[PDB]
Amino acid sequence: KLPEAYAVFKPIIDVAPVIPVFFLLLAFVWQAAVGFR
Amino acid sequence: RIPLWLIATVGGTLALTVVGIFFYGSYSGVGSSL
Amino acid sequence: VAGRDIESTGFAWWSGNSRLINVSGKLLGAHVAHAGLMVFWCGAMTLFEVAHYIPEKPLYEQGLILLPHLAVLGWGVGPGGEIIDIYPYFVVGVLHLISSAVLGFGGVYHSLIGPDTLEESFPAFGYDWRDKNKITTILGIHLIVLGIGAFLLVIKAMYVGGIYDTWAPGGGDVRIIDSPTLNPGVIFGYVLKSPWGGDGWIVSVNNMEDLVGGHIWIGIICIVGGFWHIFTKPFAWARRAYVWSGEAYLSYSLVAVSLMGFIASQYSWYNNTAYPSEFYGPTGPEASQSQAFTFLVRDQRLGANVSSAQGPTGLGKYLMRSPSGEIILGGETQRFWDLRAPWIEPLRGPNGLDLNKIKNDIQPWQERRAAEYMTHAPLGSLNSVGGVATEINSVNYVSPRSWLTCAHFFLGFAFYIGHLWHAGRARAAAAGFEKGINRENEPTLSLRPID
Amino acid sequence: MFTLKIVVYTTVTFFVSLFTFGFLSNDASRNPNRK
Amino acid sequence: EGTGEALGIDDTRLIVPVILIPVITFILYAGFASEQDNEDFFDTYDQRR
Amino acid sequence: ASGDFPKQSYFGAAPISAPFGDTYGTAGAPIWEKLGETEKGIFTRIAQTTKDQLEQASELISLGSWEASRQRLRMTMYETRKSMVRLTDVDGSKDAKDLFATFKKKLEALDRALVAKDKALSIKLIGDVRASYNKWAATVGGV
Amino acid sequence: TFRWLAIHGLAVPTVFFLGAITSMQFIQR
Amino acid sequence: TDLDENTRTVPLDSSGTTVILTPEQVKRGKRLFNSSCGNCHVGGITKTNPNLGLEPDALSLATPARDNIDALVDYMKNPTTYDGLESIAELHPSVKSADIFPKMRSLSDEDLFAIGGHILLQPKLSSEKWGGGKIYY
Amino acid sequence: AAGWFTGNPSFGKSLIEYSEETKK
Amino acid sequence: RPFSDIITSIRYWIIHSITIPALYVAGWLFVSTGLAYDIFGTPRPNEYFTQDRQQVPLVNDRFSAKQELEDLTKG
Amino acid sequence: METLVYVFLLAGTLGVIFFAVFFRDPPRIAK
Amino acid sequence: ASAWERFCSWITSTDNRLYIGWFGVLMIPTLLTATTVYIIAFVAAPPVDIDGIREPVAGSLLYGNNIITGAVIPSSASIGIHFYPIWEAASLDEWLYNGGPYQLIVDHFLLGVCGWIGREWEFSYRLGMRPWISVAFTAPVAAASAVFLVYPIGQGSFSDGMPLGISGTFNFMLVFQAEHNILMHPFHQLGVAGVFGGSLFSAMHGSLVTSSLIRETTENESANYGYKFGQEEETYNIVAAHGYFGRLIFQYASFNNSRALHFFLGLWPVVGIWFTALGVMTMAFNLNGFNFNQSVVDSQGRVINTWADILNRANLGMEVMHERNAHNFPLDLA
Ligand code: CLA
Ligand code: CLA
Ligand code: CLA
Ligand code: CLA
Ligand code: CLA
Ligand SMILES: CC1=CCCC(C)(C)[C@H]1/C=C/C(C)=C/C=C/C(C)=C/C=C/C=C(C)/C=C/C=C(C)/C=C/C1=C(C)CCCC1(C)C
Ligand SMILES: CC1=CCCC(C)(C)[C@H]1/C=C/C(C)=C/C=C/C(C)=C/C=C/C=C(C)/C=C/C=C(C)/C=C\C1=C(C)CCCC1(C)C
Ligand SMILES: [Cl-]
């Protein structure tokens, strides 16, 4: 478990490892924003 | 009038949310061994 | 839009990164941002493991894959591979996560607002893919950096705390590797060993002295090679034997990294020294030999003479001879007779498992370890139902060894495919027919017909 | 057994060396677009 | 098998072919190599044979 | 039966089929405490047996058996480090911890000698290991 | 209305069944 | 049928007294059984020693009889052989041997009660599955 | 020039087609 | 007219901010009401077995199938 | 004796493959 | 003007009937050795003790097998994945007793198909054609390495690789399903999608190209002769087929672009077979298909069976009956 002083931030750390997947997805939205140049 | 990229973004987000709710129901309640 | 559309580049959005080949600064930003992604995942995932780590179960039963690495490096683990403290894991996680912010800022900078090409504003960093000397200097700098990393592992094992030796006298423990083996005949004896059964190539490291000494050798090799490449240019035999373009270099890196992926997968599957079974769980051979050991102890306790007991087919039910004659555990564990683990070597003599030790001196801790490793075999489903395929849904478990091995075998094969794609494209583009066959000068029509 | 071993080693080394020094002999140039 | 010999070389005889056959192939390759224009070039590959 | 609504919980931990909540530490304080009667007895037994194991290691060294001598230090001694840690913490003494570390380093050096097949250094180091273990034994007391 | 008929014959059962399925995830035995 | 009290009533002591487990108790017992001993005792069997399973026939014929909550709970702290003559606390998970069995360290008296309730509740759920093995999967 | 139109004059032609060709 | 031309139209979304969620919730109350179990005969989690019916129910005759179905599903 | 028939059939298939590879109708461009 | 240069020109010659090239230098001897040893061992080879329990299994025609039952038996389980060439055997007879020919054939054949991948790349470079036919070939090769090499490595025995026969192939299938539940494993499902879709798209593409052939042929003549080899014009109307397929389903579904169509044709089966080869590679290390056994329980908590349970019954029958004499302990951990 996290150190006591940090356990309150568990719900953020629970979503923390998964952001790289979103980065890939963000790329597509960016290319969707410029209409797939 | 609504940019289709935003429509696609929100629609895919909602569809992925529905499929994830299906996945949760797969790990919870009836259909789960627990 | 210039340099970022199919009209001005000839690359579609789905080959979008192919527009970065000749844009050196923007490509630098791509690399640095992706390195930020890597360190971000490291920090976030190890923080996730720390948050989900319960002090009751062992690491291998909780689905933890990263904290085992830090435990092996010698942080927050006591004798017997018992994780006593998990604050250094938190420190490593926060350090990686914070460094990810800096690397992400650098990558986004160089990608978006930094100079497109570094070859006019920063000639020291700018390069051309066809300029062999500059590319070799960059390669040599990175080789020196890799050697520094190897020496960092050496410093950790030798001076700063030391690493976890599972083979240590008594139980496995964190100890200083004061005398690494620097003999070339051992370190490069591993490199020239065969990969087949009993040999294992470099997966067969059975002690930390060889590991640390060969990391010293790798550090020396890499630093010497980096200084060699900084002050040298490719020789004529090399200059005619390679395609000198960015895609070719990418394909070379892809094949190397695919080979590394395969080797790492088998490291996690078979090795239990750099991947101790008390952090990553039993190997498959370890679990099978543990089943045989548990039932040997049970039946011996119940009056059977295990050495003289005959199985259905005439072979030993518990103990038999390997094809080379060594006394080994029987049954379908006969294939896994090459297992060597710190819990079973104690009963091993020169000619195999000593029958006197096997009969009179099996300790209770060995039976406990064998039962634990039997019940925690690498078998499991994709939805993490531990046991054989025909088991029921009560045990939620897949070994970290299975996850790591399968993932890295997958990525190794995928990166071999990537190598094949990129090497073929590099050759075709260098020769100049990666877009199609020229209708004007078709080579086949000039060729004489066969038959 | 050893005779078969050395014969197989001879054959394997022969073909591997041919492969090695053949692809090292400026194989990239052997394309129809050269010159 | 499973002994750990380097390249399976348990007998010293095995080395004679393993080292010499590449050397004869290397000697034949050197006649090709010495005939080539071995100066540098600025291209993705060498078009001179 | 004919109009009975299915049960429905919206991410609730109350239902029997809900996966939320911890499995351990929910229904009371643990029965187990560190250094109980049976576990202290087990560690005491292991520490007492380690003397004989060391003596057998010295005998194997004297006879030149290298595999058996190495395995003697990991056979009935694989729990020596944990037992010594647990009893040293009971003692709570600096000199006990120093002798503990000294025994560990001497044992590692003895192993490094045994792989080298150095008979003289092996004999010297098993003697030193036994002396250090007996010193720690007299220190922590009860063994 | 044939376009309406086809697309909505596909759609209306689809959304109805998806709502039923998302509810069915919560039956909780 | 619901998880009625007829299913949830299990023998408590050796004399014959019964106890009605609560749904929280059986839920916690199932979770604790699957987490602490499922690896060897999935399905009411014993992977390491299949001669002695958790089916009610084996528990009833044990010495002392282990077909009740108090006897099971005592086994979880003072485990013995099938004839009750030798202590196997060094080879079995017990709360008194939790340092060498780190899964039993967090269990309380109520946790042991719930685990025993799960064990005694299972055979009522299936005619032969609990302790039956592959033949009834 | 390479020679793809010689060596097998009946290739890709049926009996009737090649027969009518050979009779011009 | 083309599909994207309809989807980006505001009128489309004024219609389908109300029409689609209505039936998406209609399915929810279809099953939450327990109405599906009655129309389709599917046992609930507490109806697979009952007294004297601790075994699997099976129809063993073609023509009296309705009769034994009521007999088994008397509940 | 069936091994004779099996071997003959497999050898005949291999022979058909050989003759198809090496005695094919040569492709030529029509005019 | 040097002997090595002439040799390299001959090896890399586009005038040989069959292209050799540098990858062919490694392929032809290896593949020929594998073919020779396979033919000799299939027609005549003594029984092999596959399971390491001194219970030889016959696989050769001369020992009472037909073409369907014949096989080159996998190596003995006693060997494991130790290298077992002829020179590591005390005699050739005991080399054949423990299934050494399987190791020889598998190693040479795997090297040969790797050489085939490289040789496909090579010819394309000489041709000036684009690469990647080689990349498509990898998917079949990957599956072959998964079954012949990676599965022994993960399980730790060459006895576990697929037998080089027809009935042995079925045996390997049934044991794999019993031990890993490959059917429920999603990568095998992707492979099934790959092969079924490959058949579907092959039939569809052939049907539409054959259906819209331009009239270039008389009634007493095969339509195939309407196409002349090396012609410049298209032999069929892409517009007609595209419009027909658009009316068949809807306009947007059809591939109006031919290059995209053929990329999709090359993509679907290659990716499917890549995925199933990778699935076998991962189940080599015992990451099995899904296990939904006893996933539905009533309110009391007793198991209501599903189709997963009934499939589990077949898997369990195969599990108990496979290798009846080889297992001495209840778990099939090896
Ligand atoms: C690891 C993932 C990765 C990375 C590092 C990059 C990086 C890059 N891509 Mg991209 N790309 C990716 C995946 C990735 N790509 C994928 C998956 C696709 C397929 C859809 C593409 C498709 C693609 C195309 C089609 C093109 C690029 C281009 C580029 C380059 C220029 C970006 C630009 O100017 O866009 C401008 C983008 C924006 C203004 C949108 C905003 C993006 C923001 C900055 C992201 C936020 C990140 C983070 C939250 C910020 C943290 C800040 C920090 C201080 C904490 C850049 C180096 C371009 C190129 O080659 O140019 C020469 C280009 O044309 N990429
Ligand atoms: C792959 C890595 C990489 C590379 C090759 C480059 C290359 C470049 N960057 Mg930089 N950059 C990077 C990462 C990288 N950057 C990152 C991660 C960031 C985010 C912090 C930035 C942010 C950044 C900015 C904001 C700018 C550049 C610019 C430049 C250019 C000039 C560099 C210069 O003047 O150095 C000078 C070097 C220094 C000042 C560093 C001195 C060393 C300090 C004291 C640290 C010491 C560390 C120590 C040795 C480490 C011990 C290791 C131990 C733990 C083992 C050059 C093209 C400039 C540019 O392109 O302008 C148009 C520019 O303005 N970069
Ligand atoms: C990232 C690492 C790296 C990279 C990319 C390169 C790249 C290069 N080096 Mg090398 N080099 C490196 C590190 C690296 N070097 C290091 C650390 C050293 C040690 C000091 C050297 C020493 C060195 C020298 C002395 C020379 C090169 C040269 C070259 C060029 C030709 C490479 C070649 O054809 O190899 C060919 C490789 C072989 C023929 C086989 C290698 C032999 C080993 C011992 C094989 C052992 C078997 C192995 C274990 C089998 C399994 C491996 C498995 C992973 C598949 C090229 C620019 C040449 C040049 O032009 O320099 C200016 C040259 O003469 N390098
Ligand atoms: C989704 C992407 C992904 C993810 C999440 C991972 C995750 C992982 N990979 Mg990786 N991997 C990937 C893709 C990915 N991989 C791909 C595509 C490949 C190519 C096929 C590989 C190939 C690969 C290999 C070859 C290996 C891994 C391994 C690992 C694990 C350890 C990471 C690590 O430390 O690397 C190494 C980290 C670095 C190189 C960064 C620098 C490290 C520095 C130098 C260390 C300094 C240490 C020192 C003691 C510190 C203190 C200094 C001082 C105080 C004394 C981890 C589970 C390892 C494993 O466990 O495999 C079974 C492993 O061996 N991966
Ligand atoms: C070191 C890693 C590396 C690097 C730096 C590059 C770099 C590049 N690749 Mg890539 N590539 C890699 C690994 C790498 N590749 C691997 C491992 C493969 C084999 C699978 C490929 C296969 C590949 C192909 C086929 C092509 C490229 C291309 C490119 C260029 C543009 C890619 C782009 O913009 O994507 C933008 C990103 C996206 C559109 C996101 C796509 C995400 C996919 C759909 C998810 C994965 C699907 C599935 C699971 C994969 C199964 C793979 C199988 C083998 C197991 C760029 C130079 C293209 C090019 O133009 O080359 C010059 C090109 O045609 N690459
Ligand atoms: C201090 C502390 C205590 C307790 C735990 C806790 C976690 C809370 C911890 C806090 C940690 C914090 C606040 C860490 C901060 C880290 C941050 C902000 C990290 C950010 C990293 C940035 C990264 C990767 C950026 C990479 C971006 C990339 C590639 C972008 C890609 C792209 C580019 C460049 C162009 C085209 C579009 C596309 C493809 C999207
Ligand atoms: C670090 C460590 C940890 C555990 C203990 C251990 C002792 C193992 C210790 C030491 C490990 C050591 C020293 C590892 C070193 C590994 C080495 C040297 C690996 C060698 C890899 C070399 C490879 C692929 C070379 C391949 C090169 C090729 C095709 C070059 C190209 C070409 C050639 C040669 C001819 C044909 C044409 C082409 C394709 C252009
Ligand atoms: Cl067995």
Coordinates of C-alpha atoms in Angstrom, one line a residue, chain C residues 194-198 243 262 265-266 269-270 284-285 287-288 291-292 295-296 299 311-318 320-321 323 330-338 373-375 377-383 385 387-394 398 401-403 405-407 409-411 413-414 416-417 420-425 427-428 430-431 433-437 439 443-444 447-448 450-451, chain L residues 14-17 51-55 76-83 103 107 114 117-118 121 123-132 134-135 138-139 142 149-150 152-160 177-181 185-187 232 259 263 274-275 277-278 281-295 312 315-316 319 322-323 325-334:
Chain C
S194 CA 24.6 -23.7 -26.8
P195 CA 21.0 -22.7 -26.3
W196 CA 19.6 -26.3 -26.0
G197 CA 18.7 -28.3 -22.9
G198 CA 21.2 -28.3 -20.1
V243 CA 22.2 0.5 -46.6
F262 CA 13.1 -13.4 -27.2
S265 CA 11.3 -13.9 -22.5
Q266 CA 13.3 -17.1 -22.0
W269 CA 10.8 -18.3 -18.1
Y270 CA 13.8 -20.4 -17.3
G284 CA 7.5 -24.4 -15.0
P285 CA 10.4 -26.9 -14.4
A287 CA 6.8 -26.4 -10.3
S288 CA 6.9 -29.8 -11.9
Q291 CA 5.2 -31.7 -7.5
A292 CA 7.4 -34.8 -7.8
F295 CA 4.7 -36.7 -3.6
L296 CA 8.1 -38.3 -3.0
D299 CA 4.9 -41.5 -0.1
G311 CA 6.0 -46.9 -11.8
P312 CA 3.5 -48.2 -14.3
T313 CA 5.9 -48.5 -17.2
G314 CA 8.9 -49.9 -15.3
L315 CA 10.5 -46.6 -14.8
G316 CA 10.8 -44.9 -11.4
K317 CA 7.6 -43.5 -9.9
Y318 CA 9.7 -41.1 -7.8
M320 CA 15.0 -42.7 -11.9
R321 CA 18.2 -42.0 -14.0
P323 CA 19.8 -40.2 -20.0
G330 CA 10.7 -39.4 -11.8
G331 CA 7.5 -39.1 -13.8
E332 CA 7.0 -36.4 -16.3
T333 CA 9.5 -34.3 -14.4
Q334 CA 12.2 -36.3 -16.2
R335 CA 12.3 -33.7 -18.9
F336 CA 12.9 -31.0 -16.3
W337 CA 15.9 -32.8 -14.8
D338 CA 18.1 -29.8 -15.6
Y373 CA 5.7 -23.9 -5.9
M374 CA 3.5 -26.9 -6.9
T375 CA 0.3 -25.0 -6.2
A377 CA 2.7 -23.3 -11.2
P378 CA 2.8 -21.0 -14.3
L379 CA -0.4 -22.5 -15.6
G380 CA -3.4 -20.2 -16.0
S381 CA -5.9 -18.6 -18.3
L382 CA -6.1 -15.2 -20.0
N383 CA -8.8 -14.2 -17.5
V385 CA -7.9 -18.7 -13.6
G387 CA -4.3 -24.2 -12.8
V388 CA -4.8 -26.4 -15.8
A389 CA -7.2 -25.5 -18.6
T390 CA -9.8 -27.9 -17.2
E391 CA -9.9 -26.2 -13.7
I392 CA -12.8 -24.4 -12.1
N393 CA -13.1 -20.7 -11.2
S394 CA -11.9 -20.4 -7.6
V398 CA -1.3 -16.4 -13.5
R401 CA 6.8 -15.4 -15.5
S402 CA 4.0 -16.4 -17.9
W403 CA 3.0 -12.8 -18.4
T405 CA 7.6 -14.5 -21.2
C406 CA 4.4 -14.3 -23.4
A407 CA 4.5 -10.5 -23.7
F409 CA 8.0 -13.4 -27.0
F410 CA 5.0 -11.6 -28.7
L411 CA 6.9 -8.3 -28.9
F413 CA 8.2 -11.7 -33.0
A414 CA 6.4 -8.5 -33.8
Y416 CA 11.1 -9.3 -36.2
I417 CA 8.2 -8.6 -38.5
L420 CA 11.6 -7.5 -42.2
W421 CA 9.3 -4.7 -43.3
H422 CA 11.7 -1.9 -42.7
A423 CA 14.8 -3.7 -44.0
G424 CA 13.0 -4.6 -47.2
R425 CA 11.7 -1.0 -47.6
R427 CA 16.7 -1.8 -49.7
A428 CA 13.9 -1.0 -52.1
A430 CA 17.8 2.9 -51.6
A431 CA 17.6 1.1 -55.0
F433 CA 11.7 1.1 -56.6
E434 CA 9.7 1.3 -53.3
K435 CA 6.8 3.1 -55.1
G436 CA 6.3 0.5 -57.8
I437 CA 7.7 -0.9 -61.1
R439 CA 6.3 1.1 -66.7
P443 CA 13.5 -5.1 -65.5
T444 CA 11.5 -8.3 -66.3
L447 CA 15.3 -10.4 -69.0
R448 CA 15.5 -13.3 -71.3
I450 CA 13.3 -18.8 -68.8
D451 CA 12.3 -22.2 -70.1
Chain L
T14 CA 18.1 -14.2 -62.7
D15 CA 18.8 -16.7 -65.5
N16 CA 18.7 -19.9 -63.4
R17 CA 15.4 -21.7 -63.8
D51 CA 6.9 -40.3 -24.0
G52 CA 10.2 -41.5 -22.4
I53 CA 8.5 -44.5 -20.7
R54 CA 9.9 -47.2 -23.0
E55 CA 6.6 -47.5 -25.0
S76 CA 11.6 -38.9 -26.6
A77 CA 10.5 -37.0 -23.5
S78 CA 13.7 -38.2 -21.7
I79 CA 15.7 -36.1 -24.2
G80 CA 13.7 -33.0 -23.4
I81 CA 14.9 -30.1 -25.6
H82 CA 18.5 -31.2 -25.4
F83 CA 20.2 -31.1 -28.8
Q103 CA 14.9 -33.0 -34.3
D107 CA 15.7 -27.9 -37.3
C114 CA 13.6 -18.9 -42.9
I117 CA 11.5 -15.8 -46.5
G118 CA 14.8 -14.3 -47.2
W121 CA 12.8 -10.9 -50.4
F123 CA 14.4 -12.2 -55.8
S124 CA 12.1 -9.2 -55.4
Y125 CA 15.1 -7.0 -55.0
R126 CA 16.7 -8.5 -58.2
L127 CA 13.3 -8.1 -59.9
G128 CA 12.9 -4.6 -58.7
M129 CA 9.6 -5.5 -57.3
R130 CA 8.6 -4.2 -53.9
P131 CA 9.3 -6.3 -50.9
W132 CA 6.8 -7.8 -48.4
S134 CA 8.2 -12.2 -47.7
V135 CA 6.4 -10.5 -44.8
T138 CA 6.2 -15.1 -42.3
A139 CA 2.8 -15.8 -41.0
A142 CA 5.6 -18.2 -37.6
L149 CA 9.9 -25.1 -31.8
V150 CA 8.3 -22.7 -29.4
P152 CA 8.7 -27.6 -27.1
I153 CA 10.6 -24.7 -25.6
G154 CA 7.8 -23.5 -23.4
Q155 CA 6.7 -27.0 -22.4
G156 CA 10.4 -28.2 -22.2
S157 CA 10.3 -31.3 -24.5
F158 CA 10.5 -31.9 -28.2
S159 CA 8.0 -34.7 -27.6
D160 CA 5.5 -31.9 -27.3
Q177 CA -7.2 -28.3 -26.6
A178 CA -7.3 -30.6 -23.5
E179 CA -4.4 -28.8 -21.8
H180 CA -4.8 -25.2 -23.0
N181 CA -8.4 -24.7 -24.3
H185 CA -8.3 -18.5 -26.5
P186 CA -9.0 -15.4 -28.5
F187 CA -5.9 -15.5 -30.7
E232 CA -1.6 -3.8 -71.1
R259 CA -4.8 -1.5 -54.6
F263 CA -3.8 -4.8 -49.5
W274 CA 0.1 -14.1 -37.1
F275 CA -2.3 -13.8 -34.2
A277 CA 0.8 -18.4 -34.3
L278 CA 1.4 -15.9 -31.4
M281 CA 3.5 -19.2 -28.8
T282 CA 1.9 -17.8 -25.6
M283 CA 0.1 -21.1 -24.7
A284 CA 3.5 -22.7 -24.9
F285 CA 4.2 -20.8 -21.7
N286 CA 0.8 -21.8 -20.3
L287 CA -1.3 -18.6 -20.8
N288 CA -4.4 -20.5 -21.7
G289 CA -7.7 -19.7 -23.2
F290 CA -10.6 -18.4 -21.2
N291 CA -11.9 -20.5 -18.3
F292 CA -15.6 -19.7 -17.7
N293 CA -16.2 -23.0 -15.9
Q294 CA -18.7 -22.7 -13.1
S295 CA -19.1 -18.9 -13.9
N312 CA -14.8 -28.5 -20.3
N315 CA -11.4 -31.2 -22.6
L316 CA -11.4 -33.3 -19.4
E319 CA -7.0 -34.7 -20.6
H322 CA -4.0 -38.6 -23.2
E323 CA -0.7 -40.3 -22.4
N325 CA 1.0 -44.3 -18.8
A326 CA 3.1 -41.2 -18.7
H327 CA 1.7 -39.3 -15.6
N328 CA 2.4 -40.4 -12.0
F329 CA 1.0 -37.3 -10.3
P330 CA -2.4 -35.6 -10.4
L331 CA -1.4 -32.3 -11.9
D332 CA -0.3 -32.0 -15.5
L333 CA 2.3 -29.3 -14.8
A334 CA 4.8 -30.3 -17.5

